[PDB]
């Protein structure tokens, strides 16, 4: 019985026929070969196909175990610590650039206003080349989404207002090739507080709603309203152990005097997804060292 699956990358869509004994790895490997991606360890096959949960597919398990064409999103799952130092291929860099830009523009990654303008200008340099008073004049940037909706909502400028501010930065990017404009975009984005972080809805022992963030450097607890500023930070080197059992997850600090952090997930599968990102990020962190 053939199963229809769609995989989308940030600038491609692929439709596949797979059998019930096709592995996640066979799907992943044919995606990466089609697009010519070598730096595979950053990436994964995403799917909101739990009974409602955002998840990452397992490569050494048959696709035919967890399911909501079957829809998959080929996306970066782990983020480098330093984008300029670590991303080797232009394709890898482009795929991060597009994924990160979508997170910013969709309001998912908070962005200050002047940063949004500057980022938008690099995106403009990447999509349009050098600004030319001849080629790009009045309204060259209408029809273009360049600033997050929450930035515009909180501010008092019109669309032409915004294009104008972006246009004055575009011109300073004369001589910048596209690939380099995409990296400069990432150099700025990777300084944003929400960049590169996987957020999970958790509760402490008192029943307060919190966020857990897992990122390349460790674990963070946020109050429900402040996803930018970690309330509690757990860098890998400050963790004695991490554990879960069903819905209960515990972080034990290296400081024998300091107390455990205990929180609760809504289901077992959430805690499993948290720990796999924990393991994946810790291992990449150790591999860099």
């Amino acid at each position: 019985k053939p199963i229809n699956v769609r995989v989308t990358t940030m600038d491609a869509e692929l439709e596949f026929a797979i059998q019930p004994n096709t592995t996640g790895k066979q799907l992943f490997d044919q995606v990466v070969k089609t697009i010519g991606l070598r730096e595979v360890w950053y990436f994964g096959l995403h799917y909101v196909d739990n009974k409602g949960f955002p998840t990452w597919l397992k490569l050494d398990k048959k696709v035919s175990a967890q399911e909501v064409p079957l829809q998959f999103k080929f996306r970066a799952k782990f983020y480098p610590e330093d984008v300029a130092e670590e991303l080797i291929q232009d394709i890898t860099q482009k795929l991060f650039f597009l994924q990160v830009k979508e997170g910013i523009l969709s309001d998912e990654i908070y962005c200050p206003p002047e940063t949004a303008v500057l980022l938008g200008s690099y995106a403009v340099q990447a999509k349009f080349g050098d600004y030319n008073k001849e080629v790009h004049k009045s309204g060259y940037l209408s029809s273009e989404r360049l600033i997050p909706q929450r930035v515009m909502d909180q501010h008092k400028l019109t669309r032409d207002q915004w294009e104008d501010r972006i246009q004055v930065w575009h011109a300073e990017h004369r001589g910048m090739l596209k690939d380099n404009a995409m990296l400069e975009y990432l150099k700025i984005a990777q300084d944003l507080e929400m960049y590169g972080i996987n957020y999970f809805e958790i509760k402490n022992k008192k029943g307060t709603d919190l966020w857990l963030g897992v990122d390349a450097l460790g674990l963070n607890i946020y109050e429900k309203d402040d996803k930018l500023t970690p309330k509690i930070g757990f860098p890998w080197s400050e963790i004695r152990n991490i554990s879960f059992n069903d819905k209960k997850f515990v972080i034990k600090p290296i400081d024998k005097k300091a107390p455990d952090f205990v929180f609760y997930a809504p289901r077992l599968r959430i805690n499993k997804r948290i720990l796999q990102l924990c393991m994946g990020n810790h291992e990449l962190y150790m591999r860099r060292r």
């Binding site: 229809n4 491609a12 439709e15 026929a17 096709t22 066979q26």
Partner: peptide, 14 residues
């Protein structure tokens, strides 16, 4: 035998 079979592709340039 279990290897996926590509039936469709869309590539966005811009």
């Amino acid at each position: 035998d279990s290897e996926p079979v590509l039936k469709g592709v869309k590539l966005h340039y811009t």
